């Protein structure tokens, strides 16, 4: 199929805001139980990057630095809606990543796609 | 293909001790980068459960209670090394879990196996 046929659409993406407090973030993270979250600015069409929940663990150490979104924000990989699942799988595999943001022909965000959902198919 | 052929051997398992402090668990988790860890008592043949790193997050919240292994530890599922990988895949999916403890014919812990390693095999 197309990446578009297996993606989590935009409105169902569980995201974080680049300005929220750690507590507000944790609330979302803990209750959604997901591992990676797109981080947005004004809305879900403007993704600043990706936050992986495991990157929060160093901040839990008793002698850790202060947490800030900038310390954990990763670059978001974007792919077109028309990208092929085979190619999508191959790319998750060779670049060793798990989530990509799907963009429409017009620069809007269509949804996210994960290696987990592809494998569940096969 | 059997579990024995794809398991991570006991000697390479990254584990946590049931009586370890939060900092000590964090050091191990951070250094290894894994998501789940068998939790042991005396040694690696004495597996008490599995801990998922993400279950530690509620203790970072500002008004959280103090961390204790009791409230995050989950029961460990044990399988024999001769089990076929196809059956293992079906049990993981049926019982909705990601990591199992593998034992040999003497009942000793021989390793761990994960669904990610099985899926990786079938790509
Ligand atoms: N941030 C997210 N928002 C919405 N769905 C997601 C998110 N992260 C992962 N998923 C979906 O939830 C499934 C479980 O992934 P995870 O929750 O990371 O185990 C994945 O296969 C994705 O389809
Ligand atoms: N606690 C662990 N000890 C040793 N190897 C592990 C452990 N957890 C996972 N692995 C291995 O490393 C792979 C990646 O899983 P993870 O590192 O949790 O993403 C797993 O499929 C296992 O093969």
Swiss-Prot record, chain A:
Highest taxon of the lineage = Bacteria
Q: Name one GO cellular component term.
A: plasma membrane
Q: Which residues form the CBS domain?
A: 7-67, 69-122
Q: Does the keyword Repeat apply?
A: yes
Gene Ontology molecular-function annotations: flavin adenine dinucleotide binding
Keyword list (alphabetical) reads: CBS domain, Cobalt, Magnesium, Repeat, Transport
* Stated family: Belongs to the UPF0053 family.
Q: What does this protein do?
A: Plays a role in the transport of magnesium and cobalt ions.
Name assigned to this protein: Magnesium and cobalt efflux protein CorC
Q: Which gene encodes it?
A: corC
Curated annotation (Swiss-Prot), chain B:
* Protein's UniProt keywords contain Repeat: yes
Q: Which UniProt keywords apply?
A: CBS domain, Cobalt, Magnesium, Repeat, Transport
Q: Does the keyword Chaperone apply?
A: no
Q: Which cellular component terms (GO) are annotated to the entry?
A: plasma membrane
**GO molecular function annotations of the record:** flavin adenine dinucleotide binding
Which residues are in the CBS domain?
7-67, 69-123
Family per similarity comment: Belongs to the UPF0053 family.
Q: What does this protein do?
A: Plays a role in the transport of magnesium and cobalt ions.
What protein name applies here?
Magnesium and cobalt efflux protein CorC
Q: Which organism is it from?
A: Salmonella typhimurium (strain LT2 / SGSC1412 / ATCC 700720)
| Primary gene name | corC
Q: Which residues of the full protein are shown?
A: 67 to 189 of 292
């Amino acid at each position: 199929q197309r990446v578009r046929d297996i993606m989590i659409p935009r409105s169902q993406m569980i995201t974080l805001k680049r300005n929220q407090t750690l507590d507000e973030c944790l609330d979302v993270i803990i209750e959604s139980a997901h591992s990676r979250f797109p981080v947005i600015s004004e809305d879900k069409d403007h993704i600043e990057g990706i936050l992986m929940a495991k990157d929060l663990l160093p901040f839990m150490r008793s002698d850790a630095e202060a947490f800030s979104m900038d310390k954990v924000l990763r670059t978001a990989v974007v792919v077109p809606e028309s990208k092929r699942v085979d190619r999508m799988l191959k790319e998750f595999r060779s670049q060793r990543y798990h989530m990509a943001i799907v963009i429409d022909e017009f620069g809007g965000v269509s949804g996210l796609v994960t290696i987990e959902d592809i494998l569940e198919l096969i």
